[PDB]
C-alpha cells in the first residue's frame, strides 16, 4: 500500500537540516544552500 519501494537512495544519503534537500553520501555540504553536513 505504501510507496516506499519507489524511494531507496544510496546508503549514506542525508537530508539538509536547513533547507530539507536530499544530499548524496559523498557530499560534505548541502548542494542547494551550502550548509555544512553536521
Amino acid at each position: 500500500s505504501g510507496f516506499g519501494d519507489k524511494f531507496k537512495p544510496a546508503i549514506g544519503t542525508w537530508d539538509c537540516d536547513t533547507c530539507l534537500v536530499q544530499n548524496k553520501p559523498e557530499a560534505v555540504k548541502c548542494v542547494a544552500c551550502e550548509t555544512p553536513k553536521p
Partner: protein
Amino acid sequence: QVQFKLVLVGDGGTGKTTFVKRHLTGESEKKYVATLGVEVHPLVFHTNRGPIKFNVWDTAGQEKFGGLRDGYYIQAQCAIIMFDVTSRVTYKNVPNWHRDLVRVCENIPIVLCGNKVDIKDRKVKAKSIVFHRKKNLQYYDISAKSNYNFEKPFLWLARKLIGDPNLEFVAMPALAPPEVVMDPALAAQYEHDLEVAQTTA
C-alpha cells in the same frame, strides 16, 4: 518518509506567500534559508497510501524570472507557476518563468495556477489561459485567500510523483480560515468555463 522539493515561482505580488501560508502546520514548521532568501514550508498531505510531504520553496523577495539565487532550483522535483488573474502582465510572464525553471529542472511535473479568482473583476479568463495546453501542463484556478482549490495542484503533483492516477487525499490539511468569500456560483461558472475552453480548438 517521502518528501518532495516543490518550487513555487511567479511574478512578485501574485500571491505565492499568501498561498503557501494557508497550510497552518507548514507555516508553524517553516524553515528559513538565509543563503538563498527562501522560506521552506513542509506541507504534509495524507493520501490513501500514507502521508506525502511537499517542501515548498517560497522566495522571500520580489525577484524577476532569472533573478532567483543559484541554489533555489537545485534538486526541485516539482513546481507550481503562479500568476494573478487580475494582472494580465503576470500571465504573459508565465512562459518566462517556465523557461527559467526548465533551464535548471529538466523533466519535472509542473502545475500552472491562476490566483485571486475571488476578485470579481477578473481579467485573465479561461478562454485566454492556453499556455498549459501548448506545454501539456495542468492548470487550476485558485483563490489563496479563500482556500479555493488549495489541494488541487498538490494532488495532481502527488499522482505524477508517485505514479498512481488513483491516489486520493483522505482529508484536507488544517487551513487558515478563509479571509474573503469565494462565491460558489462564481466557482461553478469558472469551472464550466475551463471545461468549455478545453473541449474546443
